[PDB]
DNA sequence: TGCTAAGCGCACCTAATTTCCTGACGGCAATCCGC
């Protein structure tokens, strides 16, 4: 096998639904829910952007009218409720395009070898650790008295999670609930179970009339703050929940210096720490050209990274 | 023998043609009259002699296959090209040519002159409009094939009539400039493909679809038309597109 | 180049390769007859085709299609800078004309009625017209659509020059008026609601009729809930057949309509409903009057 | 004698599928409730994670990649997807719209009637009904589904429905009574014993509550916008007829190397699936050679090759000779 | 099983003015050529 196929692509194996926001009261959290809506907020400002010295003289005491939007809780509610659900799909049944059949056979052989060693269990334990620590609450985890994340698969509600008792730079491998959910995600990733739909509900006690931060939408041409409305109510993008669920990579070359996980991307880009962490031989392209194109038994940490990107997906196609 | 009017009500055409060299929109009128003559030739082969000599073209809904951009223009889609006969027929990616496609709901009022024009002929058309295509598009469903008497049983819809006097009496220059000026003056007027003018003489060339019928190379000729409601249409007979031939001109006209 | 390539470049108003670029041979036409100016139609002899089309076969002899495209245009050859090639001295005006000599499966061939017989018409598209339309609709505001379909390789493969300059042409938009355009509302107004309760399991139904009196709250509630805000005008309502009321009783015998009972479309046929065996329960005339008055006040 | 193919041989489709429309429903009220499914616009902020030259990588590895997209997802309270499409089965002899030579028309009509005599379009029809009853027309909507239910309604008779997760996508069943009942009518429609057949298919896919629905993507070439432009039919999501038809023509299991690659491919001329990038039938078992050995150098080809030639003629297309100048 | 018939629903004057309306980075890879 010389060179990757001309049309090689992979589909997701962790399909996350879009998130809807609700308001509750924490002592009535199991019997009461209200819609949370986005409110337009025009704001008047001062001209505080940095200007060149021949523009600051004319526009330093000039009013700055700006349009914007916001989401805030009611005066009778102390808790934000976010509801999303995740569809777990198998990894071998996710190659959407592969122009060569030998390359398909080689990918299936190496995934079967990984199922023989570790049945997608460390990766799944890291995913349930990013469901249990509530990393999907990006700016909604700052300033919270109690965060409770409940996970429901099929019709069983698993015991709830004290999300604030989980460090975001460590991964627990001794929690019974995380292991029991992660074994089901592991068997779904392996192939034993054909699909797994996992529904997540998280209660964030932030306070009364406090601000809830949704996902801001992208504007392209020449704009203001447009926040995400899912079915009228406020909400977050599925992309943002998945980038907080793929923050599992502690296998990059410079981990002992920067001791925290990063999201799993092809070239190892991290927007928090603005440095590329996998720009060369430890990138997916040079770890899939040395696992299948020139057969080499890679270290297990690198294998974790390759299967994590094969759960993420993408167009990995040569010219 | 027995003149009459059959209405083929609300025919839903899916993925018809829409490209006629300079037009992306309503198909050619020769295509709808070809649906008429194909219906005629298939009925006359079940031993039902019915000469169709005039077609009404009513319009209820449309969807050009594509999307409308933010600047209010149109982007036309195409299906992914498959194996196209030629030198490059074994390559997995084929060339993309100029093509546009439309979805229409239309009602066709036909001028039918046969020995007997009854409701059995309507049943014959129902059993004949499910093996034919309008332009090059499939018929998903039709409401009803019925006989009409006057301009009151006709459903609501906007017909297409030929407006050539709004094109001959136009600004100046050449016929393209007259067309562009006329479309600037009346914004409820559309360009329409109306037939063909020969570029050669009648003869036998090699490569014909039928080697025994005469053949002539043609360009498409185009004109103007507009939309009139069913209520405000006077004495019908002005929505009835009919074939008309001359020496070198293959034209579809509303007389 | 420009004095030894003028003998294999042909002159056309019409190329066959602009419908499909796999049409064998050098097929096309050069129509130069006359403008009628009052005929009612736009032909290539009735619009102002200012610049002709030079169609090639091989990429080597593409020098006339380059010289004629350098702005000063050498199209000035109806000023006279000379001698920088001698054969080229206005030999771009007695070029061989593209003559139609055959047909193929890729040229669009259709039949046309001529006097009880038929004439096969193989349609050749016009390059120069399309070029003139694209020039005279950039400087205009009539409805227009750009066809971004032909790549430069296939436009080069067409052999034409006014397709290599204009590969993505601007053409007229002949669409029906905008109120006749498809949307969700003009389609969710052709679909009819059906009720969420099966009459054959309704728990209190006496083989078609409404035995229990407390089911009329349920029937009224479902008739409101399904279809409260889906009122339909007369043309958008479903037709009221008699085969449906017959097929309803057919379900339980009851040949004559039972005296004192009227077929009730559970969801109303004005506020959205289907003329179907599902959307009918043979309720008593008293309770039918109650339900058709309850839905009257909504 | 016949020494070539006609100078204009054309064939029309005999399995004319219609565009699809997507609906959202519940499952315990799937026969009564039906809600519209709309296609939203989702804009994304990404990273430049595509392969680029090693010089461009140093300049662009940490650069934002904003992209435009569209997406169809279900509601928070409806867990199923309803796709309803229709087919128009037509005769094979009455789908030849053009043929220049009369003797080729006579010979091809003799070969179609000989196919009506021995296995009269029945095995092909059973394969087409299997490609309705395993729900291969759910291209990426068949993954992650709890219950798939497919209902076929010829004329006005509603046939017993299918559990489309109990059919393998690589094995064609020839024993189910409903499939045989539908397939005999499709075979009689292909023979010419019936002039037309209208089949309406309605599917119910229980994927989950707010999960992603995958319509067909439109090829729209715009220079200003380059994003995922999905298909909207009458305001709501759907699928092209070509996608569903390419699903239904995946019946070819008679290619020269089926024992190695053991999966059905779509019935094309040179055996050109869009998944595997090698032509599967490129010289000796291609349609052009296997119809010039059937009609021109008369010869009784094996029944698998006759199945392939008849399946091409049900697919239809421009099937003439190498056009000359 | 009915719930009325008839006429008509103003004439004037106007609808403010100032200062301004952000800074950033970026917007994919593949493939669509006959001869």
Author numbering:
A (entry chain B): 12 to 233, 236 to 332
B (entry chain E): 0 to 254
C (entry chain F): 26 to 97, 102 to 107, 111 to 116, 125 to 338
D (entry chain A): 11 to 335
Source paper text:
Recently, a newly identified type I-F variant, known as the Cas8-HNH system, was discovered to lack the Cas3 helicase-nuclease gene in its CRISPR loci. Instead, an HNH nuclease domain is naturally fused with one of the Cascade backbone components, Cas8, generating double-strand breaks in target DNA molecules. The RNP complex displays an overall G-shaped architecture, comprising single copies of Cas5, Cas6, and Cas8-HNH subunits, six copies of Cas7 molecules, and a crRNA molecule. To elucidate the molecular mechanisms of target DNA cleavage by the type I-F Cas8-HNH system, we reconstituted the Cascade complex and obtained multiple cryo-EM structures representing the target-free, partial R-loop, full R-loop and ssDNA-bound states.
Furthermore, we also determined the cryo-EM structure of the Cas8-HNH Cascade-crRNA-ssDNA complex at a resolution of 2.9 Å with a 56-nt targeting ssDNA. The whole 32-nt protospacer sequence of ssDNA was clearly traced. The complex in the ssDNA-bound state closely resembles that in the full R-loop state, with the exception of the hook region of the Cas8, which undergoes an outward rotation upon PAM binding. When aligned with the target-free state at the Cas6 end (crRNA 3′-end), the Cascade complex in the partial R-loop state exhibits a maximum displacement of ~7 Å, while the complexes in the full R-loop and ssDNA-bound states undergo displacements of ~22 Å. In the partial R-loop state, the HNH nuclease domain undergoes mostly minor movements compared to that in the target-free state, whereas the HNH nuclease moves away from the Cas6 subunit by approximately 11 Å in the full R-loop and ssDNA-bound states, thereby disrupting the HNH-Cas6 interaction interface. As a result, the helix from Cas6 responsible for contacting the HNH domain is not visible in the full R-loop and ssDNA states owing to flexibility. Since the target DNA mismatches in the protospacer sequence are not tolerated by the type I-F Cas8-HNH system, we analyzed the structures to understand the mechanism behind this high fidelity. As aforementioned, the HNH domain swings away from Cas6 and is thought to adopt a catalytically competent conformation in the full R-loop and ssDNA-bound states.
